[PDB]
Amino acid sequence: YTVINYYKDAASSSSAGQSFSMDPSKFTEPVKDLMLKGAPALN
Amino acid sequence: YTVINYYKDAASSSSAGQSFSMDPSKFTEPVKDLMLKGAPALN
Amino acid sequence: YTVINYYKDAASSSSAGQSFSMDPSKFTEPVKDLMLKGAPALN
Amino acid sequence: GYSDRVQQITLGNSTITTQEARNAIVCYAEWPEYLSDNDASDVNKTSKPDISVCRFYTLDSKTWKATSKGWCWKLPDALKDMGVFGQNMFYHSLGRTGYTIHVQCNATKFHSGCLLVVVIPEHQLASHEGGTVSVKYKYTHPGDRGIDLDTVEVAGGPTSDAIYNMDGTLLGNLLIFPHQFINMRTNNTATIVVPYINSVPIDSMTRHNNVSLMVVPIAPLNAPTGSSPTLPVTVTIAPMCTEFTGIRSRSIVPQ
Amino acid sequence: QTLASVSSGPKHTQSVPALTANETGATLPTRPSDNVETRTTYMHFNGSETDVESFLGRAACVHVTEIKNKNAAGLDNHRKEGLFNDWKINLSSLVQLRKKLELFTYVRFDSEYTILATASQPEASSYSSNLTVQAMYVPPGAPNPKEWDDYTWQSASNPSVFFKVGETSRFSVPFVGIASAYNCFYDGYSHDDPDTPYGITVLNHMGSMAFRVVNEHDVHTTIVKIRVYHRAKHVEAWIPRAPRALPYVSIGRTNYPRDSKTIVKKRTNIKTY
Amino acid sequence: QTLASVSSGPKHTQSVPALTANETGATLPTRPSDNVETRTTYMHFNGSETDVESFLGRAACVHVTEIKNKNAAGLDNHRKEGLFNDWKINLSSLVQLRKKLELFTYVRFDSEYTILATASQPEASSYSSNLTVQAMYVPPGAPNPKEWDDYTWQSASNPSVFFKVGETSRFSVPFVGIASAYNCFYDGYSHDDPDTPYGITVLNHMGSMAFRVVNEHDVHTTIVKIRVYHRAKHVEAWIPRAPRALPYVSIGRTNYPRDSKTIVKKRTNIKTY
Amino acid sequence: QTLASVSSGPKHTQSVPALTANETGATLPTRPSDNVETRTTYMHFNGSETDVESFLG
Amino acid sequence: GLPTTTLPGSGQFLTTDDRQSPSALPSYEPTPRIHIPGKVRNLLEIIQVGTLIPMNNTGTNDNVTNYLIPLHADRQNEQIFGTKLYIGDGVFKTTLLGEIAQYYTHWSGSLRISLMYTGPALSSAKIILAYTPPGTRGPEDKKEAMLGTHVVWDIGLQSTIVMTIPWTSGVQFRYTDPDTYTSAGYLSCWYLTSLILPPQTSGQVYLLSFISACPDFKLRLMKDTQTISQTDALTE
Amino acid sequence: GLPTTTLPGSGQFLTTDDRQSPSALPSYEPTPRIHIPGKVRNLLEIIQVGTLIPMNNTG
Amino acid sequence: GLPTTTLPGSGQFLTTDDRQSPSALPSYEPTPRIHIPGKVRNLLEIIQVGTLIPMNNTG
Ligand SMILES: [Ca+2]
């Protein structure tokens, strides 16, 4: 599909695409020492 | 004739073309053993 | 972004771009003899 | 031979040790760092006192009773009287910092109880009154004492609702913020490294708290038979990568 | 093709993924194949509709106001009479969108404003008037309208749109924050004073919008209602927080009703299905 | 050029295509040249208009409803008073299209909705009001409107369209089935219960649409009638069935009138022409 | 990137930019680094909205 | 003067369209972006984080005790808790997962349930967590329960047990709003042995349960929630 | 600001036209297609199947 | 007869937009520009010039 911007300002443009750079880790594993699934959580 | 899609979503597009892959056989001759027109239907 | 003029007359066109040739000097240092910041204003 | 449980943190002239840790959280997977030129606005040179402010300061102890609701500290407020850090905090117009928060609670293999130790960026508190009433400055600026959640509410102060996180949200969802638990059967401590999080490069350290450390008993403290029904809770905090600017005369604040 | 699940058989290992330590504050990505024998299957899915651009990318009503068109002769307070009205642009007055925005702490985006103006003539009138509304963007510091036909409506430097009642107006606005992002929350004050407000910051200022009917007056009164919709474009959001549980009570305040005590649904027995 | 018929002459063979065995369940493609001397002719035809895309590719009316615009003051049931209405999207209420869809068992497609809203003022009114209708897409689980001006109409996440009476609204909707196709028929139940309904499945759910006039009230009442048309795009259909013979009586049920006994036209003599 | 301010340290010079002579009718472009120790920062700005085309546009 | 024809829908305002519009502030320069930790790109990123389930739904008012599952010593064969798997309702409605799931119409994927033990270190126990797929009634006893997806938990150093609820379904998507055809089954807990407390210890011990989605998860058809409303517009 | 001229028929709703329209559910992902025997592409496919004629129209 | 769809905002007059319009005086020739000292391009050019502050606000 095609799109050309009709306006000078960047704000005028439509929606930005899909980020495709998801990374739940910053929220799900913000641990200092790496923990590996399957190994003792605490040794 | 020409057509360019003005929208991002596939649903937005107009009608799909003609299938050109008709095959009445699945409905007219779903027989296991092949029957040939002209030969005894049952032997 | 794109723009093509739909009219014959130059007046019909939209806004001119940013000048990028600013020069406050004609207003801030219209002195005959050059003065250098840091050296005696008057000797 | 080394363990995830025994750890040492040396910051300046202070060293902390724990033999019963449960790893540690580095908020949003980001370690503190100083302000960069690309991000800087303010043209002034920043002061970096280093080892004189970036050391561990220990707050006044708390007492975990079996009826305890929780406690809340606001940073940088809680460290405003802490040695050279507090000084610098009131001579400069702007400052910036991250911290290493170390919460301590030791017990007995016979005790049971569980604390939730969480760091909340921008913890805008709800008022006792509700409506359009705001929480008075002095109530969000308790200093070292912090906010003791099982204290009677006053006019213009925050609510004392742990269940509602003092902000209209539910306790169970507090896990979306960098947190750690202190489960006696397991834990002894909780350590959280906090980077600078803000919408501006640098800010005023007195009119704005960037975070509030919250320690909330979830599982009631249950001591063994004949044991003392309480346990103290100690909070040790170290500023890291501290920067100051806009030096002048001493900032004047209410009280 | 991305795999949703892989083929996985029986186990008898020393590697126990079913056991962990939530004390650490982490949530390890276990998959059903860690505790069950599985088959290979495909995601057949990218997750487009959950992108924050998507989530905040649709128009939502953020304000409803009203204005009128009468005979302003003898009227001493045009604002009270309803000849013009204001709106201190804020996105926390209507709750549907407010709960969505607040899922995050700092939020940066461009705005796409769509303004609808519908008319009504509640009492005896010969016909329905075709009116024109003016919507003026009044930045803080610009002079405020006082009468429905002030010099202020000249609007030489303030952006303004003229549109017809029954029609709609649409324009985009760049991220107009003085900081790098908008603050959904702000645990601070304007200055260290004992009595200044808390939370509300100019750090969330988006402006004030002024409205009026440009036409003079007919024999009847016409009531114009304005609905403002906001759509966020080119979105950026940081630091997710806990959803709002309690009802909202005020703009820009986390305050909640004190008699609201049962947000969680109750049973009788923890054992019932 | 494709051949419709080939040149074919006399026969006297042992190969008898005129004889077969329908017991087998097959229908062999015999051609007139199997039983008649023929001439060569050309199809001069592709069969475009019979493609299922064609067959279901035109808009058909699938619902007609009504709403009003009065003074809602003192009215306790806005829905009954007709200030707003619902529609549980279904394609089997109007029979013209229903018989077409049902020619197949499973059907998959995108929808192109066109909404027409016309107005009428059956009793003494000075003028004809220019109204604006809001059409809200209410997915199952979203809060239902209760009053004509609820918080629900804020529609922060639900798609909605605003259009004028006399005008039309048009939008497309992706195939929103939870399965791979829509069920024209379903010989099953929601769960194995002795009293739960039969046939009707969430497997055919397309949603519910809410309607209202956005304007306030005039002195007269205005009656707005809404007609919803559906057009199928990007069609896929499986398993053809027998056409419907008997009248329909209920939505989503194959039930037919019990006093309907003569669908086939009758003669007197099997020998008459 | 254009520089809004450069890194600048202590001074003890004979070059005194803090002193001038407004009698001349000129306004010399002094910068904060002429009277204060500064850090490097970027303009992150072009000045579009102040162009006369903008101003009267 | 290019000949055109306007189509049905011309002039409509569909809140869900995405087009260009003129900028009301032409030539304006937005503040530069500064680095800010904790960037969220997709909602599927945050529902992977486990949050507490208020499983002790018993009571009248919300209270921290709703998150605490009671455990009793020297009880054998007994049931600890039970619940339906309606993530848009019941005990899961207030959780972060259920909270975000309610902004969407369909859901699909595997679920993660962790149970964290808080009792003394010197205690012991063996518990059984079970998932009963749709098609029957909730188990009435451990025998019935163990016939389905289950995990036997041995309480020890490793404080938490994690059980995944594998996508067990015919149809590929279920509705978040409780609907019979699209139900997900039941979830229950029982003692495999029993809780044993050491000398000088007594009372109840509690379990903390967490819910989060696996990477398996999907949510579609965005809509408005039932978890927030209002009778009047708010003011300052 | 491209000069145009609208033609007769502008604004009409012809149930038989075929054009693009905006999707009310942008970014939405339809369920994957699974294989299903008995796909019908054209109606000419099924009328080639013989069905019984009610020739004993009497009654 | 190119099919189109008009969008929200159609017909609005936003004082701040920038588009082409027909010239009411087609074929007209403007006077030639002559050199004039003191050209101002940006307002940031002139605020760099110092002006007196009425600091003795008293009176
Ligand atoms: Ca009339």
Among G27, G47, G57, select the one facing J44 at the smallest CB separation.
Answer: G47
**Are J18 and A8 in contact, with CB atoms under 8 Å apart?**
yes
CATH assignment at residue D236: 2.60.120.20
Whole-number Å distance between alpha carbons of F250 and F192: 23
Name the residue of chain B whose CA is nearest to A16's CA: B8
Resolution in A: 3.0
Residue F186: Cβ-neighbour burial (10 angstroms; 0-12, 13-18, 19+): middle
CATH assignment at residue B28: 4.10.80.10
Residue B41: Cβ-neighbour burial (10 angstroms; 0-12, 13-18, 19+): middle
**Distance of residue F138 Cα from the nearest chain H Cα, in angstroms:** 7
**CA–CA distance from B15 to each of B21, F98, I19, I21 (Å)?**
17, 20, 8, 11
Residue F207: Cβ-neighbour burial (10 angstroms; 0-12, 13-18, 19+): buried
**Distance of residue D69 Cα from the nearest chain A Cα, in angstroms:** 26
Can you give the length of chain D in residues? 255
F&H contacts, CB < 8 Å: 101
Bond prior to D76 in cis (omega within 30° of 0): yes
**CA–CA distance from D28 to each of A21, D195, E213, H32 (Å)?**
16, 8, 51, 22
Site from E115, E137, E163 to mutate, J interface, most J CB atoms within 10 angstroms: E163
Whole-number Å distance between alpha carbons of F177 and F204: 7
Closest by CA position to H38, among listed D151, D71, E237: E237
**Are B21 and I41 in contact, with CB atoms under 8 Å apart?**
yes
- Which residues are CB-neighbours of I18 under 8 A, at least 6 positions away? B14, B15, F57, F233
Segment (H or E) for C28: helix C25-28
**Distance of residue F30 Cα from the nearest chain B Cα, in angstroms:** 7
Q: For tokens 């019984």, name the residue.
A: I52
First-to-final CA distance of chain D: 53
Query: Residue E123 C-alpha to ligand 1 middle, in angstroms?
Result: 14
**Are D185 and A42 in contact, with CB atoms under 8 Å apart?**
no
Are D44 and G39 within 8 A, CB to CB?
yes
Phi-psi region of E105 (alpha: psi -120 to 50; beta: other; left: phi over 0): alpha
Site from E44, E53, E58 to mutate, I interface, most I CB atoms within 10 angstroms: E44
Are D42 and G41 within 8 A, CB to CB?
yes
Residue E96: Cβ-neighbour burial (10 angstroms; 0-12, 13-18, 19+): buried
Does any CB of chain A come closer than 8 Å to the CB of residue H45? yes
The 3-state DSSP class for residue H139 equals coil
Longest dimension (CA), chain J: 73
Are E114 and J8 within 8 A, CB to CB?
yes
- Which residues are CB-neighbours of E95 under 8 A, at least 6 positions away? E248, F151, F154, H228, H229, H230, H234
Are D172 and H52 within 8 A, CB to CB?
yes
Residue E141: Cβ-neighbour burial (10 angstroms; 0-12, 13-18, 19+): exposed
**Are D95 and D89 in contact, with CB atoms under 8 Å apart?**
yes
DSSP letter assigned to residue I48: T
**Are H123 and H155 in contact, with CB atoms under 8 Å apart?**
yes
Whole-number Å distance between alpha carbons of D104 and D101: 10
Whole-number Å distance between alpha carbons of D125 and D140: 8
**Distance of residue J12 Cα from the nearest chain E Cα, in angstroms:** 5
Does any CB of chain D come closer than 8 Å to the CB of residue H200? yes
Task: Enumerate the residues of chain F whose CB falls inside 8 A of the CB of residue E127.
Answer: 126-127
**Distance of residue I2 Cα from the nearest chain C Cα, in angstroms:** 6
Closest by CA position to E143, among listed E240, E208, E194: E208
Amino acid symbol at E265: K
Segment (H or E) for F81: helix F78-81
Residue D217: Cβ-neighbour burial (10 angstroms; 0-12, 13-18, 19+): buried
Whole-number Å distance between alpha carbons of B23 and D145: 83
**CA–CA distance from C35 to each of C38, F168, G16, G32, J53 (Å)?**
9, 72, 13, 19, 24
Domain count, chain A: 1
**Are E226 and E117 in contact, with CB atoms under 8 Å apart?**
yes
Which domains are delineated in chain F? 1-273 (2.60.120.20)
Whole-number Å distance between alpha carbons of E181 and D165: 25
**What is the DSSP secondary-structure string of F130-183?**
--EEEEEEE-BTBPPP-STT-GGGG-SSS-EEEEEBTBEEEEEE----SSSSEE
Boundaries of domain holding B36: 1-43
Does any CB of chain D come closer than 8 Å to the CB of residue G32? yes
| Encoded tokens for D102 | 């170390």
| Encoded tokens for E6 | 């892989």
Whole-number Å distance between alpha carbons of A15 and H25: 18
Name the residue of chain E whose CA is nearest to I30's CA: E45
Does any CB of chain C come closer than 8 Å to the CB of residue J22? yes
Residue F174's CB: how many other CB atoms inside 10 A? Answer: 23
**Order of strands across the sheet with J2-4?**
I4-6, H2-6, J2-4
Alpha-carbon torsion, ordered G16, G17, G19, G24, to 10 deg: 130
Closest by CA position to I25, among listed H87, D115, B12, E112: B12
**CA–CA distance from H84 to each of B12, E32, E273, H128, H133 (Å)?**
39, 19, 5, 17, 10
Whole-number Å distance between alpha carbons of D238 and D75: 11
Can you give the length of chain J in residues? 59
Q: How far is CA F209 from the centre of its chain?
A: 16
Closest by CA position to I43, among listed F2, B29, F48: F48
Closest by CA position to F91, among listed F212, F206, F256, F192: F206
Whole-number Å distance between alpha carbons of J37 and J19: 31
Does any CB of chain E come closer than 8 Å to the CB of residue D14? no
| Encoded tokens for F221 | 């009442």
**Distance of residue D228 Cα from the nearest chain E Cα, in angstroms:** 25
- Is the pair J, E in contact (3+ CB pairs within 8 Å)? yes
Query: Residue E218 C-alpha to ligand 1 middle, in angstroms?
Result: 14
Are G24 and C38 within 8 A, CB to CB?
no
Closest by CA position to I13, among listed I5, I21, I23: I21
Question: Which residues hold their Cβ within 5 A of ligand 1, which is an ion?
Answer: E 127; F 127
Amino acid symbol at D56: F
Please, what is the Cα angle at G14 between G10 and G20, to 5 degrees? 100
Can you give the length of chain F in residues? 273
Whole-number Å distance between alpha carbons of F185 and F188: 9
Name the residue of chain C whose CA is nearest to I2's CA: C6
Closest by CA position to D135, among listed E254, E201, E249, E105: E254
**Order of strands across the sheet with H126-132?**
H79-84, H186-191, H126-132, H149-154
Name the residue of chain G whose CA is nearest to J43's CA: G50
Which domains are delineated in chain H? 1-236 (2.60.120.20)
Are E126 and F129 within 8 A, CB to CB?
no
Residue D240's CB: how many other CB atoms inside 10 A? Answer: 21
Name the residue of chain C whose CA is nearest to G56's CA: C15
Boundaries of domain holding D99: 1-255
